[PDB]
Amino acid sequence: MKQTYMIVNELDVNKGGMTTAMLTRSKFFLDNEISGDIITFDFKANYKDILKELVQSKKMDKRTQMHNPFIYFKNISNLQHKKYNYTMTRNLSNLLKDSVEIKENSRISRFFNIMSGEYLAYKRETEQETIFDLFKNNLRYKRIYFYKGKIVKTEVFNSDNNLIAEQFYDDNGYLYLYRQINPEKKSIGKTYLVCKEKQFKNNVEFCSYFLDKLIPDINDNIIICDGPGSFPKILKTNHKNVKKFAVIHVNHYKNFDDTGAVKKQEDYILRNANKINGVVMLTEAQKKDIIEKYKITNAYVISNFINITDDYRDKNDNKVVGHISRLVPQKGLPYLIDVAKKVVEQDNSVEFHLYGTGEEKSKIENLIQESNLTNNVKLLGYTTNAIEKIKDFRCVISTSQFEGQGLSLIEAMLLKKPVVAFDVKYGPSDFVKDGKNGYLIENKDIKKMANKILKLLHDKELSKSLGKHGRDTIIDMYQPEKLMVKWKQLFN
Amino acid sequence: MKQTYMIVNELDVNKGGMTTAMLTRSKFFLDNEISGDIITFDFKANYKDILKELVQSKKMDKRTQMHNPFIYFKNISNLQHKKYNYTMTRNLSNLLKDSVEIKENSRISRFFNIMSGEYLAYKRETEQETIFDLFKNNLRYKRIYFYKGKIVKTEVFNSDNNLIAEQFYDDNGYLYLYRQINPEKKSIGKTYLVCKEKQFKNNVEFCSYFLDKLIPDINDNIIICDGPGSFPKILKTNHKNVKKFAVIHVNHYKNFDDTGAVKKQEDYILRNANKINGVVMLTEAQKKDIIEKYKITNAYVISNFINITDDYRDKNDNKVVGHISRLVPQKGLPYLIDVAKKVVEQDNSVEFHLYGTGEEKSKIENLIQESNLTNNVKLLGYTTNAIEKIKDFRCVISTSQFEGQGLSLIEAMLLKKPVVAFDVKYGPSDFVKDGKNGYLIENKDIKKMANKILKLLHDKELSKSLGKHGRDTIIDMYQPEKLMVKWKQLFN
Amino acid sequence: MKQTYMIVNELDVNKGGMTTAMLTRSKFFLDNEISGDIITFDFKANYKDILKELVQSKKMDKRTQMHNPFIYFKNISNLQHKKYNYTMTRNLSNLLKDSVEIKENSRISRFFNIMSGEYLAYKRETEQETIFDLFKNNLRYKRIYFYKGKIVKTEVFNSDNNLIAEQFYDDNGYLYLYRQINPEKKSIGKTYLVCKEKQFKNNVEFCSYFLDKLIPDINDNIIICDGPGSFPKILKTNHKNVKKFAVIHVNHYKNFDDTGAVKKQEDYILRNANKINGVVMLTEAQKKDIIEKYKITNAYVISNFINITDDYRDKNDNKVVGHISRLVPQKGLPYLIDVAKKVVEQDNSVEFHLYGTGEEKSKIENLIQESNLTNNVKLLGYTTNAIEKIKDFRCVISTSQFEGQGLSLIEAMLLKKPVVAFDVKYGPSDFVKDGKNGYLIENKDIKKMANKILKLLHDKELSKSLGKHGRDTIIDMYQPEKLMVKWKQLFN
Ligand SMILES: [Cl-]
Ligand SMILES: [Cl-]
Ligand SMILES: [Cl-]
Ligand SMILES: [Cl-]
Ligand SMILES: [Cl-]
Ligand SMILES: [Cl-]
Ligand SMILES: [Cl-]
Ligand SMILES: [Cl-]
Ligand SMILES: [Cl-]
């Protein structure tokens, strides 16, 4: 049974894109006797609960395992000793002994000695998460983190209360990892594995060491670096038999850059692509651009797996248009506010409920009132669920100028719902067949977009027909069975 | 018996203006069954001795009491415990045990360990005031203050030897107050009352808490905020029955500001005058300007109390003219040096002994030599006593461009001595009746001032007559009995 | 027996100029019943070994003694106590007890506690020289130096890891010296002698105290300040009978300064020359310039002692020209590279092996390749020995624009070897008699220098004759016996 290892840095809840796609990939892979496991490199004491919530929310398969350096070496150190280190816990209590706890809030509480007249510590008692900011001469020297009534991590700060070193302890109370962080650049430098008496120059060396000790050197094990920041770690691994790949999930080109400069991260994975066993893209256009600029031969194009769920039941209604996209400078609805203003001049009754939070939200809502859209638009409260939310909604908007793959658009095709793409990143040129299915209009085409959106709403049955065969288009193009065959060819 | 509470921040020795006026006010108030007590907010271990010296120097009545937050809460904590905290004292001795005291001076002495090779502490043994600057890694971490062989206050410093926190102990050796000071802005921030397990955001909240716990909420108790910086503390008090007033002792207008901008402090007490029960002024002109710009209705005009002392006995003499005013940029004798130079060209024998120290003193004395007045002027050594000093002197000068009330001028009227005002702040338009009494000449009138001063000296008996009825003018206008009647009307 | 005291700051190995000259001076002085002792002011635990190596390398006489403040007061403190201070040593071991030593290199080793999770110390175990950089909150607080398994010196650093204080211990483990260093200006300030409970404002006061306690106040003892930086220390000595002198070994004029500004150090020794009993120069020209600008009367001219070694035996050969001079901006071979390029255009076979390291070396070697001299020149590897190295070499180059005394040139005269001076500092106008002996050509005379160098090589026997009587010239002018007679006249 082939053991694939999707490489990322973090895997938290309420996070889509690569995260969700990797979970989907794992399930489909395992369905064809190919163990799908995720490799993270972040520290989270709540990781157990996070992954549990995900599995329970059908956001990941139970077979999908998560390998993390911290947990791995924690278990190694847990077996080195037998007794519990009560030293730190006792010392903390003896410091806050006969102290006066001045509670500012219900959680916030500061400790003071009346006998030594010294500020001892600060405590924010969050649910089973007490954080003791220890003080010396009214200056923070340490910050003890707690979980399940056990010290999980301590942090030493400098004269500017900036992190200079982080420390990680096992479930026996002993140190296994010591990382020195540069106050400037905020970069994890000299890393020390005290559980194996080892010294690393960077976290890259530590993460590579972890991967070399976890993944055995056989062609039975594949490595799929989905994250563009974890690539340096898969490039330094001392493996010579394990195949390594790099899945690109986004536009390699920098956001809003007419210059046509490629993102530093993606540039590296494409310049040093002569070292990896393949670079996987989702769009044929992405391939053309990359395989021209970098002139690479390992440019393979296999799209992301997508579940067809079920068939909807003629859910017809209309109260508001919807972008259904997280607020992003270019990958949001910036110019779509102007489109809404134009539609308001025709039908003022038409509202606009676009879900998703972000930084642009502020200016967008301010510009709404400016363009007399205080009531004419009514953005949703980033409702977690979307499938059932807009199952009855049609005429979805897509003013993205830099998309990597139209996931939401391909989902609406299976939801028999029309779309209004701007065909500015060729992420929807594959899905929206213009007249046939959806509306692949040009970029900054507010005029044409307005007419299309209004007509689409008016012609209900007609628009449904366009989307109904659009489902079949998606089903055919992105056929799960066909996709994993391509993966197998690349892997083996 | 009405209990008035004059609110100021500090009350030290060798300090006039509000300080002296408040003491005078208290005496006169008490003479009419109205307890006159002063409220300070500063920390001074020597306060007992300071107030004793004042009472002994007839600079305050024995009935005038002083309420201070530090002392109040010190007594509260002194009753919480029974034994003495010898911990700190013993620890200090054990640190400086078998140490080598290298005495730089008679007072300055540094301690060094030959066994640990560490700089322990620095000690400046002033009379019963040992200050131990404790050192760690040749960097000051603490500064222990001593009084009556008891730790009174400790101070924790940062990497730049700048105060980050101050601590105050009781007479039992326990902490009752902890104040965090921002290294920048040098402002007392988060304040902690460990004697009552309370937390304050600023010293304003702590001082308001003190006033709310001291002054009961009845109309029998009045609050007279004489200090312009203590007003925010009387504005935040949770009293709803206690009447609050604001006495202005100075020109609200900024010093040397043709722009006519009002001092930020005074501006606040006049913009938020709609909250207090009255704003007391000393000059009718001050009222007109304030009651116009701020358009307030609670603008009352009652002048400061002044003692008539006794009647002089024709003390006639002349060796030097005298300004008898502390060196101040505009409230000093800047242009009066040019006046002196002009008089020298007429009578070179005429000397100029003006008492009072300041920053301007340097340039003034340098400009003296420049204007050939090295000997032609001979400033006095800021002799504390003035009443008896210039009792025999006549032709006093007043080149103040921004005075709030001519106290020295009104004193010379009772001393039957002529004056030479510049009528530039209308502080002397009330007293100096031009020809009748003194010489209320215009501003920058060196020419006219010279002629007036010379003539005044020459005509002795005539000048005395002008000042003799000037005493009666002051007596009538500023009649003690009449002033306290006005106060009573405002209070009740 | 007269006791002369040559005053310098440091006396390390592989160092010429004053250092070597002082050793030579001492030997010759002692040969005439005049004790020659060197006074240093630097701390070096290896000083014993350094001076031993020198004596063994015939680089100093066994009679030449070295007096150092550190050693002097160390012996004083060694007699104050009897037992050894094991405190520090034990405390160091107890800190690194049950610690995990993570060895980065063979020497570099860091210590970590798994029970307290704290970075303890850093250790670079050089041959019998363990340096423990003690750490607190991942910040360096101390640096313990070791020698013969004994703490010799500790150093306390600040928040910027910059020295704030240095500490020195005796052979019994007790502190005798504590010096506070300003992080800015890097200057030893307040100095404390804990062995004699004394306090000094600077190291000047401490070094003067040392000299006042070492040298008795009689005319039997002379002080020769050879070092220009130790002069302030001989100017503040409380001696009134001991004669003080100042030997100038270099050009008082600043390097590459057409302005003609005199070096601050030398300027001081010549402006405050009215205080010392004489200023000794090596060049009559130096005297003229100094005795004109400063108009001093104590300007004496006695040249440095030089050993005539033996007579060479017609060592004739030629493979490369040689400057035999440490790389220095103006006192090096900067323009001599252009001279070499010109010679290459005539004889490309001619190589150029100039010995001596420096900063200019980089640019010089780069400019070699630039001027097609990658192979045409071949600088030697700064071979310590020079006497025997180029004993067979002739036509030595001297493109120095600011020399104080042509030592190497005077050595080649005794080695019967021609020279090519630039007569730009008049250091060789005394030695090179142009046609008669060597070649005293003008400055920036690449043209003339080229012709001279080539002709000199061609005419072997002739060039030898010029150098053979040049030895006699040096022997006569710089006659050892004659020089010490001049010294005696000045001393007594
Ligand atoms: Cl135990
Ligand atoms: Cl216990
Ligand atoms: Cl490699
Ligand atoms: Cl006890
Ligand atoms: Cl005791
Ligand atoms: Cl309010
Ligand atoms: Cl012992
Ligand atoms: Cl032992
Ligand atoms: Cl002197």
Author numbering:
A (entry chain AAA), B (entry chain AAA), C (entry chain AAA): 1 to 492
Can I see the authors' text?
Staphylococcus epidermidis expresses glycerol phosphate wall teichoic acid (WTA), but some health care–associated methicillin-resistant S. epidermidis (HA-MRSE) clones produce a second, ribitol phosphate (RboP) WTA, resembling that of the aggressive pathogen Staphylococcus aureus. We report here that the TarM enzyme of HA-MRSE [TarM(Se)] glycosylates RboP-WTA with glucose, instead of N-acetylglucosamine (GlcNAc) by TarM(Sa) in S. aureus. Each blade of the homotrimer contains a catalytic domain with a canonical GT-B fold, consisting of an N-terminal acceptor substrate-binding domain (ABD; residues 1 to 68 and 202 to 302) and a C-terminal nucleotide-binding domain (residues 303 to 492). TarM(Se) is a retaining WTA glycosyltransferase; therefore, the relative positions of donor and acceptor substrates in TarM(Se) and TarP are different.
To understand why the closely related TarM(Sa) and TarM(Se) proteins use different donor substrates, we solved the structure of unliganded full-length TarM(Se) from S. epidermidis at 3.2-Å resolution. Like its homolog TarM(Sa), TarM(Se) forms a symmetric, propeller-like homotrimer, with three blades projecting from the central hub that mediates trimerization via its trimerization domain (TD; residues 69 to 201). In line with this property, the elution profile of TarM(Se) from size exclusion chromatography corresponds to a molecular weight of 162 kDa, suggesting that it exists as homotrimer in solution. On the basis of calibration of the column, TarM(Se) wild-type and TarM(Se)G117R mutant proteins have estimated molecular weights of 162 kDa (N = 6) and 55 kDa (N = 8), respectively, in agreement with the calculated molecular weights of 180 kDa for a TarM(Se) homotrimer and 60 kDa for monomeric TarM(Se)G117R. mAu, milli-absorbance units. Since the resolution of the native TarM(Se) structure was limited to 3.2 Å, we generated a G117R mutant [TarM(Se)G117R]. The C1 hydroxyl group of RboP4 in molecule A is 33.7 Å away from molecule B in the homotrimer, which corresponds to a length of 3.7 RboP units. Therefore, it is not possible that three TarM(Se) molecules in the homotrimer glycosylate the same poly(RboP) chain at the same time in the processive reaction.
